[PDB]
């Protein structure tokens, strides 16, 4: 997915 | 600035360092594994073969703790081989991010060269592998003049090795430093930072306060040594 916080 | 491990990392969210054994740990979110290696990155190994979307990582004692974004838990495993894998928390209401240990015992301590006259740097210094490394602030354009000890404005007027660079950009000749004469005007060439490591020409005379004067400035027309040591002991 997204490697965000 | 050099790369340590750079072959197959994708999404290295976590990084940890174990001072007890000097091994480096990191975690990958896409590869979903936690790897260890030496500080040089030679003895690379895999500690945990499946760690999901790990974000934070921290090693204390015999275990490595990491938070997982996918399954909102905190896990642990043995730092050497990844055994004893258990979940510290239930599924948290939100995704945990970041992790650290609170340790009361003082960690490894070493003598900071910056603790002595700011290490000779002008504004900001940090202890390097061999000695204190000077640095310049984030605002303004600067360059490491004067043996990388002085941060001076980067106007492009680079000046000769036969000269001493001031904080004002003026380059008096290098013999004028630390003679208790404010040749800089603002006293930059006379600050205690440089005089603690400077030294007096062999063809000059050394003052008690660290200043340097030619011999014809002793017991002479006027006092210019700063502690009356030129006029004393003729």
């Amino acid at each position: 997915x997204x490697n965000x916080x | 600035r050099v790369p340590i491990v750079n072959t197959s990392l994708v999404w290295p969210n976590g990084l940890a360092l174990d001072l007890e054994t000097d091994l480096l740990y990191w975690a990958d979110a896409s590869l979903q594994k936690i790897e260890r290696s030496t500080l040089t990155g030679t003895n690379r190994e895999v500690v945990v073969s499946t760690a999901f979307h790990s974000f934070g990582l921290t090693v204390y004692g015999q275990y490595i703790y990491w938070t997982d974004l996918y399954t909102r838990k905190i896990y642990r495993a043995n730092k050497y081989d990844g055994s004893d894998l258990v979940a510290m928390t239930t599924r948290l209401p939100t995704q945990p991010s970041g992790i650290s240990t609170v340790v009361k015992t003082q960690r490894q301590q070493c003598s900071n060269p910056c603790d002595q006259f700011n290490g000779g740097c002008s504004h900001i210094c940090a202890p390097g592998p061999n000695g204190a490394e000077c640095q310049c602030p984030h605002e303004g354009n600067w360059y490491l003049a004067n043996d990388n000890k002085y941060c001076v404005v980067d106007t492009g007027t680079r000046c000769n090795q036969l000269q001493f660079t001031c904080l004002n950009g003026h380059c008096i000749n290098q013999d004028w430093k630390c003679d208790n004469d404010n040749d800089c005007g603002d006293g930059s060439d006379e600050l205690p930072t440089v005089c603690a490591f400077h030294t007096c020409r062999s063809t000059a005379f050394t003052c008690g306060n660290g200043r340097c004067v030619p011999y014809h400035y002793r017991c002479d027309y006027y006092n210019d040594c700063g502690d009356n040591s030129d006029e004393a002991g003729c």
């Binding site: - | 073969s49 760690a51 999901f52 896990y75 004893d84 894998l85 258990v86």
Partner: protein, 387 residues
């Protein structure tokens, strides 16, 4: 040479300082760490009747040291050499490990041939194995041709396949359809889809054919029975019914020496049960540290029953009596909800309903983990077609 102590003066480890040679175990710490007063000092030289060592001997600066040949190890007190029991470490020898005085002997079943190393053996046949898995809509068979995996469907009219097994005598593939409530059979070439059980099935979990006695065993979750029938499905009877709550797993050992059956039940008080086929000699073999047991398979050369767990998330094996229980994959996040199990040579294959993948790994230690294929739906059944 660069600055160090290149002369005979005894240099302490890591330091730029060297000391006199008389310092060794003389009573006063001379090196910064006291290496002269070494923990291995005050041991008699090898002139003291070989220093008591049972093999070759050393009498270096640090007291004395006993050494042993290959296949041997030191005792705790370094008094004598001791043999390594190479068969006591699982997976060291693929089949039938035998321990010698300082070495090991190995052999494999008549279907296997030993390799250059005397530990590993491979199948003697010239035919590669086939891996058959049960996706919801289709049956997927993997041509295992030197890791050149090639997916293709086996049968087309499948709607919901759960169980899978094969008959080597006739070369057919058996499966049960959950939506149709039928058991089918086909040739490995996808031809001759004939029915065997057309009614009397509600939720058939796994199917295990008896290739020696020409029988067919299966477990039905809704009926809570273990049933047996002829290989063509003619004569059906209920085999096990007393305390059978939620039977899932099923494995068979039709070899006349064993003639034994195993099944798994995940009701209250879950357990793995062992009984002789015809259900006379019934006993429980595994009931400790078990919760949602799922899937069974038998290592025929070693007579080990491999079993899996969906709640505790492990893969284990044990003897036919339940003893020598061991873990191959435990405390590992790779397992989420494994369902079915399959063995071949030294590899173990299982289907995971959580990750929707069928995976592989060393059937002894659980390493060398890899992915076999990704399935759109949950892969339920799995079996390996090979003589």
């Amino acid at each position: 040479q660069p600055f160090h102590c290149p002369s005979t003066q005894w240099q302490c480890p890591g330091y730029s300082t060297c000391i006199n040679l008389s310092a060794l175990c003389d009573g006063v710490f001379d090196c910064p760490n006291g290496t002269d007063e070494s923990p291995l000092c005050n041991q008699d030289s090898c002139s003291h009747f070989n220093g008591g060592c049972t093999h070759q001997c050393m009498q270096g600066p640090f007291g004395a040291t006993c050494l042993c040949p290959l296949g041997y190890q030191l005792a705790n007190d370094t008094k004598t050499c001791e043999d390594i029991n190479e068969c006591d470490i699982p997976g060291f020898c693929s089949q039938h490990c035998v321990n010698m005085r300082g070495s090991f002997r190995c052999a494999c079943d008549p279907e296997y041939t030993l390799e250059s190393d005397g530990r590993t053996c491979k199948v003697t046949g010239s035919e590669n194995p086939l891996l058959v898995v049960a996706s919801r809509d289709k049956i997927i068979v993997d041509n295992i041709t030197a890791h050149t995996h090639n997916l293709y469907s086996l049968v087309q009219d499948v709607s919901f396949v759960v169980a899978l097994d094969f008959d080597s005598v006739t070369g057919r593939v058996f499966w049960s359809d959950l939506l149709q409530g039928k058991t089918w059979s086909v040739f490995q070439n996808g031809t001759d889809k004939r029915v065997v059980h057309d009614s009397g099935l509600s939720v058939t979990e796994m199917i295990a054919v008896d290739w020696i006695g020409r029988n067919l065993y299966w477990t039905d979750y809704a009926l809570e029975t273990i049933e047996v029938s002829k290989i063509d499905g003619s004569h059906r009877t209920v085999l096990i019914s007393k305390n059978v709550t939620k039977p899932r797993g099923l494995a068979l050992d039709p070899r006349m020496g064993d003639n034994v059956m195993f099944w798994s039940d995940w009701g209250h008080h879950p357990r793995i049960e062992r009984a002789s086929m015809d259900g006379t000699m019934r006993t429980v073999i595994v009931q400790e540290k078990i919760y949602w047991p799922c899937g069974l398979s038998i290592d025929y050369p070693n007579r080990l029953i491999y079993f899996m767990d969906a709640y505790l998330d492990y893969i284990e094996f044990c003897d036919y009596d339940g003893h020598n229980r061991r873990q191959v994959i435990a405390s590992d996040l790779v397992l989420h909800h494994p369902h079915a199990l399959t063995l071949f040579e030294d590899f173990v294959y299982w289907t995971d309903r959580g990750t929707r993948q069928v995976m592989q790994a060393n059937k002894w230690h659980g390493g060398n983990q890899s992915v076999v294929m990704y399935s759109v739906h949950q892969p339920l059944g799995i079996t390996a077609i090979h003589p």
